[PDB]
Amino acid sequence: MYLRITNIVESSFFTKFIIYLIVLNGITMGLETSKTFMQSFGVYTTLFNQIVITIFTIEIILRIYVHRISFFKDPWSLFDFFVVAISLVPTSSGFEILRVLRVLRLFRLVTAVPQMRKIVSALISVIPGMLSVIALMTLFFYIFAIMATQLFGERFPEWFGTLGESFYTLFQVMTLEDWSMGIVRPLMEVYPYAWVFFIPFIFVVTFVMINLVVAICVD
Amino acid sequence: MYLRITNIVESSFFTKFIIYLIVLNGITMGLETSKTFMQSFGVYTTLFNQIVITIFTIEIILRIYVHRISFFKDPWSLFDFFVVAISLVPTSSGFEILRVLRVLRLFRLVTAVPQMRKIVSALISVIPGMLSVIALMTLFFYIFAIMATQLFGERFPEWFGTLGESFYTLFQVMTLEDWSMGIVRPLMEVYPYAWVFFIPFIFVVTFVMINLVVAICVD
Amino acid sequence: MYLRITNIVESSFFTKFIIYLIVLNGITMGLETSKTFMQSFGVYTTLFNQIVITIFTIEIILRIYVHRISFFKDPWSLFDFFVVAISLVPTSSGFEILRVLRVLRLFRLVTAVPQMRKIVSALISVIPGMLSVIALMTLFFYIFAIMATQLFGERFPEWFGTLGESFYTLFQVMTLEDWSMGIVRPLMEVYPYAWVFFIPFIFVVTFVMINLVVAICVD
Amino acid sequence: MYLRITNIVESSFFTKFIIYLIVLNGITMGLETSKTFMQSFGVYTTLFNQIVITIFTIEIILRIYVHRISFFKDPWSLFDFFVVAISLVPTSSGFEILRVLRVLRLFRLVTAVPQMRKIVSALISVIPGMLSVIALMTLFFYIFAIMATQLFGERFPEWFGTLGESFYTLFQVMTLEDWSMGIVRPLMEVYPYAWVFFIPFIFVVTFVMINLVVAICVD
Ligand SMILES: [Ca+2]
Ligand SMILES: [Ca+2]
Ligand SMILES: [Ca+2]
């Protein structure tokens, strides 16, 4: 019976039947957004949902017999596994993000279809040749975030009060979003020289970030 | 008479006459902006308009005899047809956008002058090599937009209350416009961890967008 | 005496003396900024100023005999001419920007020192390649500016009231600065569909702008 | 004893031991952030802190007996010396920033580990091929900063009242952060034509900056 199912799984129908479900459940999840649609057809789509979740475990099970150990060393499969697992944890208990993380299954349209897979893979593969920079930056952020916490946190706790807050504000400055009117100008009303900490921080972080982009244009 | 008009139409004078009209109607449309100019010479400009709009249909009518099926297979020609058509819909009824959409005819200066055509074509040609990434993001936006509507839309309906609002707000975060002061910091007053949804969202969307530019920097 | 002066002007010492003056008149202008410094050395600086202006017209006159027609076909020389000329209009009559535009002469440090010239020339040379796009954009800006003035300027005259205002606001949207909180979110409280005019505008203008940069990254 | 200590210094164990201390002191400094942790275990920390500082001077002393002049001609060695130096000035007197600047020793992780050194050196190496442009810009900023201080600093002294302030505001405009709503729109309520100073400032500065990036996508 092994080869019987291995012929069902690898079957074009089966794969295309999955893709067909994803695009339906996808459509169904955006409808679950509407408070109106739920008061009409809520019970409809809740069954339809639990239905699909079964079909996906059945599939992921069948998918496993056909592949065994090979499957738990496939990125895309592991994904599909973990994303279905999330959808299995009972519609209750613990944290309620689990009801919300369920929409991560629509990322299966990425897994279950090449070209998507291509592009994702194209994208991801650029990451390792960035990790040197990413390391440098994180160290940099870590250092300045500490300095900032101990230079502005006392008068400005909302923004620098805690190591994490400073991380956040520093990230915010790096995206240059409202950095001068929102932060440094206020800061300067008390710490006139605070510009000395933030202009350099901006030059460095943006310089590095430009390099990181030109890096991905020579690779 | 066929070859007679095919020598009128295809003539230098003809094209340069059309171009001469465009640049003239264009100037006329910037003048229709001034409430002053209209209280003076409004009658002048409304007739001038109907005049040019006639001339353009005559031309588009002529243009079709000389070309038949070749014409409704020319991007640029179809454009002019569609654009002139919009300008034909009476100055009344339906929506007023139609009255406003008329100014789209000034895009004929692109259609009816090479180099422009070249440049436009240069640009448009880059698009198909982006559709994979574009597909990817549109899926991504859709997934997060749904997630956001159900994580934040109750306490924050202006921004995430509806699927559409979430799309809009998410777009806004992507342009990095006022994302931290305007949205996340507020969100965090109630959902302390909301940062865990938006920072990753920003890395992903920024990263992708960097690649999409690096792609166009090789093709 | 022609070759006598042509050996004075073309002389190293002459150039290095001009340069030495620029950097001094430069420093002196940053000091004319201080309200304090003027109350102590204002006369010193106004005299020093009138002096240098003479020295520069002498130079520009000499430079002319040594070059004649060759001079008024040199960008860099013409610049120095026009710049010095500006500095010549008396400390009165007319507009008062003329008194302010005087500081444009510090751009002589660029004109009269190779290396700057090189880089400047390196920069300017990129512009011709961009004019097809720049034309395209300007046409586009002109078209949307007109649409905006007639779609939004009745309720929103600060931002779209006049063809020029719209230009400005549209420019602002293109720099993405505060475009959603500042403008479109407001517009939508009255024109729910305004998003349909601004999202496309943003895509197009940012797309083009990405091309334009990638263009320069090839020529 | 020389070759004894030369063998100790050059020893893998020694370098790795240093690296181990850095990652421990690093973790310590992030913990020194918590007012809780400090009440509990501050003593533990400040002493562990002083210990590390001793070890590092010893190391830096040893490192010099083994390199002499070769050391003070090594950027990385110089760095380390100057950083530990900072950390050495007592926990009192002068400017309390020194106490804060101590955290700069965590940059030793960069210096004591290659790959980091590689990346940093990769990064820095790009700077000289930029100094022509940087000089250009700095001249530019200086000229406009002066113009602004004298065109706007009387009615708008927060932003332009001083050469320094104008420098800051001009930088802010360059990052495009809040430049229209924050500054020019206000400015224009008094100086209608102020747009003529800032749109050009923006074009130039953005253009130059695009060139600078493309310059690094060649070199
Ligand atoms: Ca911004
Ligand atoms: Ca802002
Ligand atoms: Ca504000």
Side-chain angles (χ1 to χ4, degrees):
Chain A
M1 193 198 181
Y2 168 87
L3 285 185
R4 156 194 154 172
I5 74 187
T6 306
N7 259 254
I8 310 175
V9 152
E10 238 82 345
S11 75
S12 172
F13 163 85
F14 188 68
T15 262
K16 296 198 303 182
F17 176 65
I18 291 312
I19 302 187
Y20 178 77
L21 270 196
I22 291 180
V23 170
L24 261 53
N25 193 208
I27 291 174
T28 234
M29 274 168 157
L31 284 239
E32 286 201 306
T33 270
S34 166
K35 320 219 304 302
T36 263
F37 171 92
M38 291 280 90
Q39 275 176 345
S40 300
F41 319 139
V43 171
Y44 269 33
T45 201
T46 333
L47 288 186
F48 177 84
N49 254 269
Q50 177 77 346
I51 285 183
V52 173
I53 228 293
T54 322
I55 302 188
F56 274 60
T57 325
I58 291 309
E59 167 198 355
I60 204 71
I61 285 176
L62 307 176
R63 278 253 307 270
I64 282 180
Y65 290 170
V66 178
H67 283 94
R68 206 43 229 186
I69 171 184
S70 220
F71 167 92
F72 292 79
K73 293 185 75 174
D74 191 42
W76 315 88
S77 299
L78 290 160
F79 184 80
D80 289 24
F81 183 46
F82 283 112
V83 156
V84 169
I86 295 162
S87 295
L88 285 168
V89 169
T91 169
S92 294
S93 306
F95 280 148
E96 308 295 338
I97 44 166
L98 293 187
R99 180 183 305 172
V100 155
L101 286 177
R102 288 172 187 178
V103 74
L104 294 177
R105 80 175 53 130
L106 311 190
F107 275 115
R108 266 185 132 262
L109 189 92
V110 163
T111 282
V113 175
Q115 310 141 91
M116 289 316 165
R117 273 203 184 189
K118 177 56 64 268
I119 217 313
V120 164
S121 307
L123 293 176
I124 289 180
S125 51
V126 200
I127 292 171
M130 263 164 31
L131 305 187
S132 309
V133 168
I134 297 180
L136 188 61
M137 283 284 283
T138 300
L139 178 72
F140 191 77
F141 266 75
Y142 181 75
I143 288 167
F144 272 69
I146 289 182
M147 312 191 91
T149 294
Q150 78 190 174
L151 276 175
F152 309 130
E154 208 72 76
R155 289 282 195 113
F156 293 90
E158 191 198 330
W159 300 333
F160 303 109
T162 245
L163 210 240
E165 253 128 33
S166 308
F167 252 102
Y168 185 88
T169 310
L170 282 175
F171 180 66
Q172 186 194 303
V173 179
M174 154 165 74
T175 81
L176 298 178
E177 181 249 331
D178 202 10
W179 71 273
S180 179
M181 296 323 199
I183 310 279
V184 180
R185 286 193 192 277
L187 248 45
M188 292 189 277
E189 300 301 355
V190 170
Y191 296 128
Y193 294 104
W195 64 272
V196 157
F197 180 109
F198 287 85
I199 309 296
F201 178 89
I202 282 178
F203 271 103
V204 166
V205 165
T206 38
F207 177 64
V208 153
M209 246 269 176
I210 296 155
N211 287 134
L212 179 145
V213 173
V214 154
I216 314 183
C217 200
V218 93
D219 306 18
Chain B
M1 192 185 161
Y2 174 90
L3 283 194
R4 164 196 152 175
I5 63 187
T6 307
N7 275 265
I8 303 181
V9 154
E10 204 107 342
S11 77
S12 178
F13 168 86
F14 197 55
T15 278
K16 298 205 299 182
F17 177 68
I18 288 314
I19 299 188
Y20 179 80
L21 272 198
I22 292 182
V23 173
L24 227 80
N25 195 200
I27 291 186
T28 240
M29 277 168 160
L31 281 179
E32 292 201 289
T33 269
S34 170
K35 308 203 306 303
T36 284
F37 183 95
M38 292 281 93
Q39 266 175 8
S40 300
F41 319 144
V43 191
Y44 279 27
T45 203
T46 323
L47 295 185
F48 186 95
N49 268 270
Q50 184 80 327
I51 289 177
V52 176
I53 224 282
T54 313
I55 300 183
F56 270 53
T57 323
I58 291 306
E59 175 211 353
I60 205 67
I61 283 178
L62 301 183
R63 281 247 309 275
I64 298 176
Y65 284 9
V66 187
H67 279 102
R68 212 39 226 200
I69 202 193
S70 214
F71 172 91
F72 294 74
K73 293 191 69 162
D74 190 42
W76 313 90
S77 305
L78 288 163
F79 181 78
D80 315 345
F81 181 53
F82 285 140
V83 174
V84 172
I86 290 162
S87 291
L88 286 162
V89 175
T91 165
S92 295
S93 319
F95 287 145
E96 313 283 356
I97 61 168
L98 285 178
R99 172 179 298 171
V100 162
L101 278 187
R102 289 178 184 177
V103 70
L104 289 184
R105 80 170 60 126
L106 310 192
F107 271 110
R108 287 209 78 233
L109 189 77
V110 162
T111 222
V113 166
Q115 317 168 68
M116 288 317 167
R117 269 211 191 184
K118 191 56 59 263
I119 218 313
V120 164
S121 290
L123 306 174
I124 297 180
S125 48
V126 200
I127 294 177
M130 278 160 80
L131 298 169
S132 302
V133 155
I134 296 176
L136 182 53
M137 292 274 296
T138 306
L139 175 70
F140 193 79
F141 267 62
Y142 186 72
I143 291 171
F144 277 65
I146 288 173
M147 252 152 125
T149 297
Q150 60 189 357
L151 285 168
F152 302 132
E154 228 75 78
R155 295 282 216 107
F156 294 86
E158 197 187 315
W159 300 334
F160 306 104
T162 245
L163 218 219
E165 272 137 23
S166 304
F167 253 99
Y168 183 91
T169 299
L170 282 177
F171 179 71
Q172 176 193 317
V173 183
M174 167 172 67
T175 68
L176 292 186
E177 185 241 320
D178 199 5
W179 68 272
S180 189
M181 297 315 208
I183 307 283
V184 178
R185 280 191 193 278
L187 241 55
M188 293 192 274
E189 305 297 349
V190 172
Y191 297 125
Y193 286 107
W195 66 270
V196 149
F197 178 113
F198 293 85
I199 313 289
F201 178 91
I202 280 185
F203 276 93
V204 162
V205 166
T206 312
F207 181 75
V208 160
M209 253 265 162
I210 301 157
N211 286 144
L212 176 142
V213 176
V214 134
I216 307 178
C217 204
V218 175
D219 313 358
Chain C
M1 190 182 164
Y2 174 93
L3 286 183
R4 160 186 152 176
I5 69 186
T6 308
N7 258 259
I8 301 174
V9 154
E10 210 95 329
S11 72
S12 169
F13 164 79
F14 194 63
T15 277
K16 302 208 299 173
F17 178 64
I18 290 311
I19 299 183
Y20 171 78
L21 273 205
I22 291 175
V23 172
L24 248 61
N25 188 217
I27 290 179
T28 217
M29 279 172 157
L31 285 234
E32 293 205 289
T33 274
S34 177
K35 323 214 310 300
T36 269
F37 178 88
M38 293 278 91
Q39 289 188 338
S40 291
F41 296 78
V43 183
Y44 277 26
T45 315
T46 327
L47 269 187
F48 181 95
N49 251 271
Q50 176 71 312
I51 290 178
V52 178
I53 231 292
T54 307
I55 302 189
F56 275 58
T57 319
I58 291 314
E59 166 197 11
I60 204 71
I61 283 181
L62 305 178
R63 284 251 307 278
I64 287 185
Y65 287 167
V66 182
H67 285 96
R68 212 40 225 195
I69 189 199
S70 222
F71 171 90
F72 299 97
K73 291 187 68 170
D74 192 41
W76 312 91
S77 305
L78 288 161
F79 181 75
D80 303 10
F81 189 28
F82 284 107
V83 173
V84 164
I86 289 162
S87 294
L88 280 173
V89 170
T91 329
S92 316
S93 289
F95 280 146
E96 309 287 351
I97 47 167
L98 291 190
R99 171 190 297 187
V100 174
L101 281 180
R102 283 175 187 167
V103 63
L104 289 184
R105 77 172 68 119
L106 305 197
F107 274 110
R108 275 191 127 272
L109 187 83
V110 161
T111 205
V113 165
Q115 290 213 60
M116 286 325 178
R117 278 193 178 204
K118 174 58 70 274
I119 219 311
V120 163
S121 294
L123 292 166
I124 287 162
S125 47
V126 197
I127 294 173
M130 287 165 49
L131 308 168
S132 310
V133 154
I134 293 185
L136 182 56
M137 283 283 291
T138 307
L139 179 71
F140 196 79
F141 263 73
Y142 180 75
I143 292 178
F144 275 64
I146 291 184
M147 281 171 68
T149 287
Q150 69 191 168
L151 280 177
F152 302 137
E154 211 74 78
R155 298 284 209 107
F156 297 89
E158 190 190 291
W159 295 340
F160 301 106
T162 251
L163 196 261
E165 256 143 358
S166 304
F167 253 96
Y168 183 89
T169 302
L170 282 175
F171 181 62
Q172 182 189 320
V173 188
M174 157 176 55
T175 74
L176 290 183
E177 178 234 343
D178 192 22
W179 64 275
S180 190
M181 297 328 202
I183 311 283
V184 181
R185 286 252 201 214
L187 255 48
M188 295 193 276
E189 307 294 356
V190 169
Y191 299 123
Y193 285 107
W195 65 272
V196 159
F197 180 111
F198 292 82
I199 309 293
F201 182 88
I202 283 187
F203 270 101
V204 161
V205 171
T206 39
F207 185 64
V208 156
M209 270 269 155
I210 299 151
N211 294 147
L212 180 144
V213 175
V214 129
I216 301 184
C217 197
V218 175
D219 315 5
Chain D
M1 190 182 166
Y2 171 90
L3 284 179
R4 157 198 166 167
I5 79 181
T6 298
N7 274 277
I8 304 187
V9 150
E10 231 74 353
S11 74
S12 172
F13 161 79
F14 186 65
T15 279
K16 302 206 310 179
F17 173 71
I18 288 314
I19 301 196
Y20 178 83
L21 277 199
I22 301 189
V23 180
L24 239 79
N25 194 208
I27 285 180
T28 277
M29 287 162 157
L31 289 233
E32 284 201 302
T33 265
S34 167
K35 315 203 313 305
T36 276
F37 181 93
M38 285 287 97
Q39 286 177 338
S40 296
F41 322 130
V43 170
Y44 272 60
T45 284
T46 347
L47 262 183
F48 171 87
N49 226 267
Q50 174 76 330
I51 288 175
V52 174
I53 231 294
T54 321
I55 302 189
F56 270 82
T57 326
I58 291 306
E59 168 199 352
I60 215 65
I61 284 170
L62 304 180
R63 283 247 304 270
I64 297 177
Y65 287 171
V66 182
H67 286 91
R68 207 44 228 195
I69 182 193
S70 215
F71 179 92
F72 294 88
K73 302 200 76 176
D74 185 43
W76 315 89
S77 300
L78 285 176
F79 181 78
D80 303 16
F81 176 59
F82 281 137
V83 171
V84 186
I86 292 162
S87 292
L88 274 173
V89 168
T91 172
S92 324
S93 167
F95 273 158
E96 276 245 42
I97 62 159
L98 291 175
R99 167 181 306 190
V100 163
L101 281 188
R102 289 179 177 168
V103 67
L104 292 177
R105 82 177 62 136
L106 303 200
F107 277 112
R108 269 193 124 265
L109 182 69
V110 167
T111 216
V113 179
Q115 317 172 64
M116 291 314 187
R117 282 170 151 208
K118 192 55 58 269
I119 222 306
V120 162
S121 302
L123 292 176
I124 290 177
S125 55
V126 205
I127 291 169
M130 270 166 19
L131 304 164
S132 303
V133 134
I134 291 183
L136 182 55
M137 282 282 274
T138 307
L139 177 70
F140 196 76
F141 268 75
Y142 185 76
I143 289 175
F144 276 64
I146 289 182
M147 308 192 81
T149 295
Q150 72 191 167
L151 278 178
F152 305 130
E154 222 84 74
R155 301 283 217 104
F156 298 88
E158 194 190 270
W159 296 335
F160 296 111
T162 246
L163 221 209
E165 283 158 344
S166 306
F167 251 95
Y168 183 91
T169 299
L170 283 177
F171 180 70
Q172 178 187 318
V173 182
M174 161 171 66
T175 75
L176 288 188
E177 173 247 326
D178 197 12
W179 67 271
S180 186
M181 300 323 206
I183 306 283
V184 175
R185 279 194 193 280
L187 245 60
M188 277 187 289
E189 298 303 354
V190 173
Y191 300 119
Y193 293 102
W195 62 276
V196 186
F197 178 112
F198 289 85
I199 310 289
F201 180 90
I202 285 184
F203 270 99
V204 167
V205 166
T206 39
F207 182 69
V208 162
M209 259 273 160
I210 301 155
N211 284 291
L212 187 143
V213 163
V214 172
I216 305 176
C217 195
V218 163
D219 328 340

